[PDB]
Amino acid sequence: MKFTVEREHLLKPLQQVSGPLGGRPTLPILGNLLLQVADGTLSLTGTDLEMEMVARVALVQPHEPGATTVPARKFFDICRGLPEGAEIAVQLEGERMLVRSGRSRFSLSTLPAADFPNLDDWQSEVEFTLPQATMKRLIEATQFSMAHQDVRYYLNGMLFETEGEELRTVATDGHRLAVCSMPIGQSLPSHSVIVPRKGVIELMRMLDGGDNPLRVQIGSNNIRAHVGDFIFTSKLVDGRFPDYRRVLPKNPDKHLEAGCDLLKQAFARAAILSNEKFRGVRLYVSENQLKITANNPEQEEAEEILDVTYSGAEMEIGFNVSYVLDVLNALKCENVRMMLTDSVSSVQIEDAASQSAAYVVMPMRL
Amino acid sequence: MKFTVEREHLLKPLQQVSGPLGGRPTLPILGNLLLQVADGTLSLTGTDLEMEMVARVALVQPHEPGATTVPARKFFDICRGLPEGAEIAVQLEGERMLVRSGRSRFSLSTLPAADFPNLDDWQSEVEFTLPQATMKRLIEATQFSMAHQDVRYYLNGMLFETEGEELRTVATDGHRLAVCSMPIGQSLPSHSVIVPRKGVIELMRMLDGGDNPLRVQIGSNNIRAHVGDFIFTSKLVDGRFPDYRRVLPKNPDKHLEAGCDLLKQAFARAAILSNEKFRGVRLYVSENQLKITANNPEQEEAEEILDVTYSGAEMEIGFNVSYVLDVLNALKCENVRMMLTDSVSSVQIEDAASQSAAYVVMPMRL
Ligand SMILES: CCC/C(=N/OCc1ccc(-c2ccc(F)cc2)cc1)[C@@H]1C(=O)CC(C)(C)[C@H](C#N)C1=O
Ligand SMILES: CCC/C(=N/OCc1ccc(-c2ccc(F)cc2)cc1)[C@@H]1C(=O)CC(C)(C)[C@H](C#N)C1=O
């Protein structure tokens, strides 16, 4: 195995493939990148066993085929530390990989490419393309609502649901929920999968700002995304995800509208004086006005009053303020609508001007 | 106690008096800031007992004298979270402090200002003034060479020395040394003090880019710096410090000169393949050449060769590359000079074009 490539054709591919990978991944070969030369292409692969990232770079200079595995971080640091415009010559020599540029020479130890972890071939069942921007939307809008290390492994992930001509994401906690759907201009079978925590991260990470569309393929136990010359594959989470349709409030006929930024700053200042563990705030809704109060064990107290649009009956409702701020932070819009039923029922929050996404939050007893 | 102040007049002083790496209190009252209104000025004071930071803010609106102490981080978060241009009215009310602006109200818990730790009055013995830029130069030039938790506790600080019309800093950890002197245009007594690590941190963080000069006063056991309406005071470290003059190599009659950036990048690449704990690299110097090699336990190896200016005898010398890189990063010059004696003696490194700062590093046996 040999190749010579310009440093700058190596930088992004390298950064993109080291994104997976554990902490001494306890499996040391997981700290290595699999390098493969075949045809006129160098392929770079990283994996953490659950997912795998692959980049292709075209070889215009003379090359010889073969494969090896090298420590990912060190090979990246070498390449990155060389001067702009450096030509990097790489050759596999016995149990070492030799890198030379200019009058700099480096030998890295290798692990055999035969030993590198290989996700099994699988069959795609649903395939679609969509703008990168739309995947970013769908992820941003819901990520913050996934569980973290919940016993219910499937809540630690994000549901991806194809339905009609839309792709939808759904994330929940057991306490708060987010869902977002976006039209994609393709007629799709109905299909639901759960993408793990690390895999949604990696998906997001692949997105770059350019005109490369995202090409997706889903199988029974895998998802794959291809943008440009990178391809990301993840295992799926095997469990049944709750139905968002069952979670959305049934009869939320009391509707409050308010400026997003004023609401979020009023909640953010109150939070300062809410209990650091439980974060409870109390909302008093009355004609055209909202009052937010917070208190803590030290007996400290905040109160915020703002003008809002509200015609229904007066009610008092407690919320974990972090749940509320998370939603208001992800909405990024002029005005917000909160849809309320009673003091004992969940509330729905969305952009006053869009039904793309919906957030549901369980009130707190208090 | 009562005052009304514009928010943007509180923001900077608040930030300056809340002095970082003390996130974990000790005594509770230490987590509070001391507010005092007297003679038309609000004074705000933070302390960890070893040091104290005081800001004064002129009060043009009606105000009423008195003092209290409030949770530092909460009062800051409250003021910062209010809207641009907010007027903040504060009044002390029982065992609570009432903060109100617009239609936001807050009540914070207090502890008696009578209880707040006082640092005792002490008398200055040396006083001088000097530009912030020159204090910044002095600290950045040497700070990185301070010890961390060495048993020889005086090494964990920085020496500030007045001599002639210069102020000098020195820092050393027993393995490497930095010294920097800058002229200050005042004739001063010869005097030496050790500033503790946290005090040098606070001295640096009070430098703002402005041309409020530092007014410095040193007593037997304390240092004080006054910049604008901010006054910082620290205990001194009571011990005797190594004489740098001792440590400077006897006479190093082999001089190597090289471009700083080319040298630092060759060392930075090599270090990748050095031992992660001991970080040894070898230097072979030869007519107009330097060769740097590194290896690690897995038997990986880096070589760098570059052109330099060098006429003396060939030599091999081993160094901890992190020490060497620290120096090259702190010198921010075009060319550097290394001053060598033999394989078992320390090297001195400086700007080839300036003698302002000197760095001494002891060789390692590889
Ligand atoms: C064996 C699977 C058990 C289930 N697991 O779902 C976990 C789960 C439960 C509740 C929420 C939730 C989210 C937001 C909210 F405002 C109120 C509740 C989110 C997730 C069911 C479920 O699938 C239907 C359900 C209506 C979500 C039901 C409730 N409540 C359940 O507990
Ligand atoms: C009781 C005094 C303890 C001492 N403490 O100093 C600790 C100390 C020792 C060595 C260094 C040092 C710094 C740079 C270097 F290249 C080589 C050595 C820096 C500090 C003495 C000292 O003050 C004079 C001395 C020549 C630095 C001597 C040595 N070597 C000492 O050990």
From Swiss-Prot, chains A, B:
- Region 1: start-end pairs: 1-120
Q: What is the effect of changing A133T?
A: Reduction of synthesis of beta*, probably due to mutation of its promoter
**One of the protein's GO biological processes:** DNA-templated DNA replication
What Pfam families is this protein classified in?
DNA_pol3_beta (PF00712), DNA_pol3_beta_2 (PF02767), DNA_pol3_beta_3 (PF02768)
Instruction: Give the highest taxon in the source lineage.
Output: Bacteria
Cellular-component GO terms for this entry: cytosol; DNA polymerase III complex; Hda-beta clamp complex; replication inhibiting complex; replisome
Please give the annotated consequence of changing R24A.
Answer: Mild defect in DNA replication, impaired loading of clamp on DNA, polymerase speed is wild-type. More severe replication defect and very poor clamp loading
Conditions for induction: Part of the dnaA-dnaN-recF-gyrB operon, but also transcribed from at least 3 promoters within the upstream dnaA gene, induced at 42 degrees Celsius. Induced 1.5-fold by hydroxyurea. A shorter isoform, beta* is induced by UV treatment and also at low levels in late logarithmic/early stationary phase growth (at protein level). Beta* transcription induced by naldixic acid.
Q: Kindly give the SMART domains that the UniProt entry links to this protein.
A: POL3Bc
The record's section on PANTHER family has: BETA SLIDING CLAMP, DNA POLYMERASE III SUBUNIT BETA
What does the miscellaneous comment read? The temperature- and UV-sensitive allele dnaN159 does not grow at temperatures higher than 37 degrees Celsius. The global SOS response is chronically induced. The UV-sensitivity of dnaN159 is dependent upon Pol IV (dinB), it has an enhanced Pol V-dependent mutation rate (umuC, umuD), and is absolutely dependent on the polymerase activity of Pol I (polA) for viability.
Instruction: Say what the protein does.
Output: Confers DNA tethering and processivity to DNA polymerases and other proteins. Acts as a clamp, forming a ring around DNA (a reaction catalyzed by the clamp-loading complex) which diffuses in an ATP-independent manner freely and bidirectionally along dsDNA. DNA bound in the ring is bent 22 degrees, in solution primed DNA is bound more tightly than dsDNA, suggesting the clamp binds both ss- and dsDNA. In a complex of DNA with this protein, alpha, epsilon and tau subunits however the DNA is only slightly bent.
Q: What is this protein called?
A: Beta sliding clamp
Q: Which organism is it from?
A: Escherichia coli (strain K12)
What is the gene called?
dnaN
